[PDB]
């Protein structure tokens, strides 16, 4: 994933064939550029009649006017289709993964049933299908049997694999990823057409993308500026015909195009596409452009605890403090109890506790390992591998089964409840006979370098709020590790709607971010709904934006595009409107020098002839569309600053750069028509 | 000479802000429906014995009350001039007017403009003047404020649907803003030397054998809101240079204050209602900076003056032609920027005889939306079509929806301000196109050359922008000009009122937000440096090719 190819010399060769398929009357939905199309139309229709018979006879000039106005239309459809052509291969980088599959299913709902050979497109929602290890996932669904690690590299470009669990919080499996370790039996939750991969296809492949309600409001200015420049140029002919003789139409169309903001109407259809393609290149799937454009204004975001902040593994392991129990005997039989803890939460104490010791001096079932699973009358999993019993004591049932023999602890374990309050964990108690091991706690294990990301998010001026359904006790130690601004625990999903409407009633835009089915009422009502990729397949569908790598702070890469799809729109307006100052200092002393010779003092740039000056304006209006295609594709980079300190900055480059650059561009191109000396 | 040129501008603005400050709090109470001290109880009678229920009203009902007043606003006036001969207070024997000259001026005094294409002392009787052209001189200046009261209200209401009440508003601007202020402005003029009587025209046997017939009539009553409402209908042909309308220099300095008295204090009143004083204080800081630059250009271009006067053996090259020697050049150059940037149209000095570099700025400042310290009414919402434009292309280059005072600017409020701006540079580019394509328009010129185009261009620019100034060489008593302007005036006002109420009706149903860490500060020397940069560019790129064939072609020759 190189993620950046301006001229890959094969897309642009496949582009020009499509750009010439945009010249006929389908540009009339772009009214800024459609006037340039009619501007290039009749200047041929003048010059063709000027070639045979007309009142003037300078056909070698006006055919060079139309010899760049079509090039201007050809460059507007160039940048419009290039970003569309960019998103073809951007989508085909992952579209060529889905059609490489064909499936097989188990007719009984357990592992090890009767098989068949059915292609993957024939499947529906609710099919017990089998994927053994080493293959690729043919269809989306939830894992109900088996637990394995899968390679999610084909769809999002990862070096690392990712693990799964059956019926927990790793129900996410996406059709197209390779499976590595073990077998999985999944049940499909989507259909071909309702596919998660189809969300990217039908949006990109087609002209079905509607305009955002800020792209719409920008064209209304870009129409209203062409309405004046239609009037303030096509009424110059009765203004000039009275005094002396008139001005030819071949100039008054060249003056009409050089004042119309052609350098935006060629790029406004390109910004709204290339911004959406930069969203996909940052591993974020956007349903529409509106949720991207609304994301520039968001000042309040929310996060789930389970899965959003951490990995959702709901597991940890710290120590065994116990009188008489050695530190060497931490993983003596508690590891065996964690081998008896057949839940994937129990696999953590196998892994996380030995990371200091790695005392691997045992076997699986050599000492008669009576693997007892998660029971019902005791609600626990244990093992009779020592002479005594080894049972996972729960929160309340320490007395009910584990210390039911009359033997208990001296009161250290009573203050281990207090140490849960000092930790904010989901603890597990193990007691082996009278020898009380105590508590191995399971707090949460928050993954990334999120401390710098929340610090980068506070400079962007956005309040950070933690929202969980779990209690206030767990949220204390998690927030101190996270570095969030505020936090609020003990929330139903109805209460999660009762915070969004405590900010949307204040007018702010609310960014819910979560993974669970409790998030799904809040995601379908909030504004920017970023759904994690680890989350349930009913929450991704109920949201409006889905990450591909479960990064909670990837909204920072969303606001960095929702601003770039506005800074590029704003700058090119005040670039193009500031261009027209030097346009009148190129045309007006040259267009009226036949009629009013005393206007030659307004030629500041010392332009050579009253014909090459107009040719320099049409060429400069055609070149500067192309030289701003890397601006319309790569966005506008920015330091994250305040409002009135960036608006100062963003006008030195454009509000003053739009003045000086046409004073340079007309000089150079006229010097190119003087060194070559053509016209 | 600029030492006493700079002092004139600084004296004119020093006295201005001292007078407009306590009137800003006066106009602030009327926006919030707070009665003035003293009018309480009196309005209990006048709103009930007449009968107006103080019923709050939405913008659609509000719009057909100002328009509805101004439909029988001209229906009375169009009939008071055709049936002028059957009316009292005619000491002469003036007949009923022609239909084209009536329709030219029946529109013209409703439309806050007062274009006078006639000699007022050989056209109008007193009852044609007194109860026909002051009754509309109040109800056009109040008709502009009753719009702009319903736009400042549209920025302070929260999620409502009711602007105010029009007839409860219109009975306050006339009875307690226009009348008790233009009574003292009137009675000051009679002391200084103006005219106020009902006598017939008194003949004169001069110190030589020649005779002259001095026109008398009620002037100083009609003169006071000729300047206060930024309206500009002089009783005589010379709108502010006839000695019975402006006798000394001190009346002139009151009349310069009386122009910028309502549309300056109405923006101080805009600071009071929003809570932030600096929110309205920056808005003068964007108007008056364009004004001071556009006075120092005109004063410089008239001290230089006509260069031919030195070769013809005069004393200096100072262009004292067409300027009253009661007034300076520095005072005449100051007035001809005040009377054209502010939609007043009182001519103190015939604008043809300016230099073309100094005659272009009073034709600039009309064409640029009539925005910079503009007319009573149109000075603020004419700027609010450019504030709401400069909020757009500033907020959008932050990565932010264009919020102004908490209110967002959505698509429906850009489909209107596009159509609201586009009325005034359409008609001055369609009327000036139409009047140069014909022979009934081109034959009405007076000066030859490029300047004769500028007389066509200054005329239609003081029709759509509702100024009322004239080069006055344009003999616009033809039935073409009397009807071309009357189209271009009636649309230039009431094609802007409709997409301002539709803006204002769309901004009441929204909800104002609060300031935060990332909202753009509207006050301050950056946004003012952009608001001036937005006004002086959209009003620049759209009129340079119209001006480069006019006076710029005249000046460079």
């Amino acid at each position: 994933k190189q993620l950046a190819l301006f001229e890959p010399t094969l897309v642009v060769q496949a582009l020009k064939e499509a750009v010439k398929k945009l010249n006929p009357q389908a540009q009339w939905r772009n009214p800024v550029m459609f006037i340039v199309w009619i501007g290039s139309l009749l200047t041929t229709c003048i010059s063709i009649a000027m070639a045979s018979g007309a009142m003037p006879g300078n056909a070698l000039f006006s055919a060079a006017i139309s010899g760049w106005l079509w090039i201007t239309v050809l460059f507007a459809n160039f940048a419009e289709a290039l970003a569309e052509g960019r998103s073809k291969a951007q989508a085909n980088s992952l579209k060529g993964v889905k059609k490489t599959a064909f499936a097989r299913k188990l007719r009984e709902p357990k592992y090890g049933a009767a098989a068949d050979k059915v292609p993957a497109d024939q499947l529906r929602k609710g099919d017990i299908v089998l994927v053994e290890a080493g293959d690729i996932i043919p269809c989306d669904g939830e894992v109900i049997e088996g637990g394995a690690s899968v390679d999610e590299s084909a769809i999002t470009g990862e070096s690392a694999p990712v693990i799964r669990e059956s019926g927990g919080d790793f129900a996410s499996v996406t059709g197209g990823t390779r499976i590595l370790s073990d077998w999985l039996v999944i049940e499909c939750s989507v259909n071909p057409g309702e596919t998660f991969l189809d969300r990217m296809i039908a949006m990109v492949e087609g002209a079905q993308r509607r305009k955002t309600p800020n792209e719409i409001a920008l064209t209304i200015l870009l129409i209203a500026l062409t309405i004046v420049f239609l009037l303030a140029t096509a009424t110059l002919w009765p203004f000039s015909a009275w005094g002396g003789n008139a001005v030819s139409v071949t100039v008054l169309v060249a003056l009409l195009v050089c004042l119309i903001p052609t350098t935006i109407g060629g790029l406004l259809s390109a910004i709204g596409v290339a911004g959406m393609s930069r969203m996909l290149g940052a591993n974020v799937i956007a349903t529409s452009g509106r949720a991207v454009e609304a994301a520039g204004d968001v000042d309040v975001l929310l996060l789930d605890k389970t899965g959003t902040i951490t990995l959702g593994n709901r597991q940890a392991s710290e120590f065994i403090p116990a009188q008489g129990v050695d530190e060497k005997t931490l993983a003596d039989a508690a590891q065996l109890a964690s081998l008896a803890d057949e839940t994937p939460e129990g696999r953590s104490i196998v892994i996380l506790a030995k990371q200091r010791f790695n005392l691997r001096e045992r076997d699986v079932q050599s000492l008669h390992a009576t693997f007892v699973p998660f029971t019902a009358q005791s609600r626990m999993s244990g093992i009779n591998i020592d002479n005594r019993m080894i049972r996972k004591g729960s929160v309340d049932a320490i007395r009910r089964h584990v210390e039911a023999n009359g033997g208990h602890f001296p009161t250290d374990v009573d203050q281990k409840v207090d140490q849960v309050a000092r930790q904010g964990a989901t603890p597990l108690v193990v007691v082996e006979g009278s020898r009380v091991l105590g508590v191995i706690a399971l707090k949460d294990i928050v993954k990334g370098g999120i401390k710098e990301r929340f610090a980068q998010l506070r400079k962007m001026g956005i309040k950070t709020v933690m929202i969980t359904g779990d209690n206030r006790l767990t949220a204390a130690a998690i927030a101190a590790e996270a570095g969030v601004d505020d936090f609020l625990a003990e929330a139903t999903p109805e209460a999660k709607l009762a915070l969004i409407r405590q900010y949307q009633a204040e007018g702010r835009l609310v960014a819910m971010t979560g993974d669970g089915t409790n998030d799904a009422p809040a995601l379908a009502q909030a504004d920017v709904a970023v759904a994690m990729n680890s989350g349930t397949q009913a929450a991704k569908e109920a949201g409006n934006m889905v990450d591909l790598d479960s990064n909670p702070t990837k909204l920072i890469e969303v606001v960095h595009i929702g601003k770039q799809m506005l800074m590029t729109r704003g700058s090119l307006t005040t670039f193009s409107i500031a261009n027209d100052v030097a346009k009148y200092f190129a045309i007006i002393p040259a267009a009226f020098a036949a009629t009013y010779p005393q206007l030659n003092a307004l030629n500041i740039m010392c332009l050579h002839s009253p014909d090459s000056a107009i040719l320099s304006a049409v060429i400069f209006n055609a070149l500067i569309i192309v030289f701003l295609i890397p601006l319309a594709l790569k966005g506008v980079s920015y330091k994250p600053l305040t409002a009135s300190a960036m608006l100062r900055r963003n006008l030195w480059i454009y509000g003053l750069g739009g003045l000086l650059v046409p004073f340079i561009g007309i000089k150079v191109i006229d010097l190119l028509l003087t060194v070559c000396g053509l016209v | 000479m600029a030492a006493q040129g700079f002092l004139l501008i600084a004296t004119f603005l020093l006295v201005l802000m001292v007078l407009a400050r306590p009137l800003g709090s006066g106009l602030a109470r009327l926006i919030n429906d707070i009665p003035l001290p003293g009018t309480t109880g009196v309005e209990r009678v006048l709103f009930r014995a007449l009968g107006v229920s103080d019923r709050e009203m939405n913008w659609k009902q509000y719009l057909c009350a100002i328009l509805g007043l101004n439909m029988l606003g001209l229906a009375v006036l169009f009939f008071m001039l055709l049936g002028q001969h059957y009316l009292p207070l005619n000491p002469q024997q003036l007949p009923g007017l022609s239909w084209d000259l009536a329709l030219n001026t029946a529109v013209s005094f409703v439309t806050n403009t007062n274009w006078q294409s006639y000699s007022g002392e050989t056209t109008l009787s007193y009852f044609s003047q007194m109860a026909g052209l002051t009754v509309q001189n109040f109800l056009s200046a109040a008709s502009g404020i009753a719009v702009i009261f319903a736009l400042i209200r549209a920025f302070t209401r929260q999620s409502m649907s009711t602007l105010g009440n029009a007839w409860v508003d219109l009975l306050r601007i006339t009875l307690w803003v226009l009348v008790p202020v233009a009574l003292l402005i009137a009675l000051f003029f009679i002391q200084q030397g103006a005219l106020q009587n009902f006598l017939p025209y008194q003949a004169v046997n001069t110190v030589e054998g020649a005779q002259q017939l001095l026109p008398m009539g009620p002037v100083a009553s009609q003169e006071a809101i000729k300047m206060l409402g930024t309206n500009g209908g002089g009783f005589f042909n010379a709108n502010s240079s006839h000695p019975f309308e402006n006798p000394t220099a001190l009346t002139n300095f009151v009349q310069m204050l009386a122009i910028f008295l309502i549309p300056t204090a109405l923006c101080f009143a805009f600071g009071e209602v929003m809570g932030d004083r600096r929110q309205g204080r920056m808005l003068l800081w964007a108007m008056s900076v364009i004004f001071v630059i556009c006075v120092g250009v005109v004063m410089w271009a008239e001290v230089q003056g006509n260069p031919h006067l030195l070769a013809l053996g005069t004393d200096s090259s100072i262009n004292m032609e067409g300027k009253e020697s009661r007034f300076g050049v520095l005072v005449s150059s100051l007035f001809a920027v005040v009377t054209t940037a502010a939609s007043c149209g009182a001519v103190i000095a015939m604008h043809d005889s300016f230099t073309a570099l100094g005659g272009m700025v009073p034709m600039w400042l009309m064409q640029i939306g009539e925005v910079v310290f503009g007319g009573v009414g149109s000075g603020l919402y004419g700027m609010m079509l450019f504030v709401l434009l400069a909020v757009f292309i500033a907020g959008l280059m932050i990565g932010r929806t264009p919020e102004y005072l908490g209110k967002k600017i959505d698509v429906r409020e850009m489909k209107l301000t596009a159509l609201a701006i586009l009325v005034t540079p359409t008609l001055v580019l369609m009327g000036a196109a139409l009047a140069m394509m014909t022979d009934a328009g081109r034959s009405a010129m007076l000066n030859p050359g490029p300047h004769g185009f500028s007389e066509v261009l200054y005329a239609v620019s003081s029709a759509a922008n509702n100024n009322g100034s004239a080069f006055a060489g344009l003999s616009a008593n033809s039935p073409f000009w009397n009807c071309l302007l009357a189209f271009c005036m009636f649309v230039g006002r009431f094609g802007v009122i409709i997409p301002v109420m539709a803006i204002a009706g769309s901004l009441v149903s929204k909800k104002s937000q609060a300031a935060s860490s990332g909202t753009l500060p509207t006050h301050g020397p950056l946004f003012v440096g952009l608001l001036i940069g937005t006004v002086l560019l959209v009003g620049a790129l759209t009129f340079i090719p119209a001006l480069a064939l006019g006076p710029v072609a005249e000046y460079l020759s």
Partner: peptide, 27 residues
Amino acid sequence: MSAGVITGVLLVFLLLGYLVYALINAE
């Protein structure tokens, strides 16, 4: 005002009518 003058006027009002119709619509 020849025959081609009224052609150029109706080419403007076609365009001036088209752009106004584009302004009142979110096409």
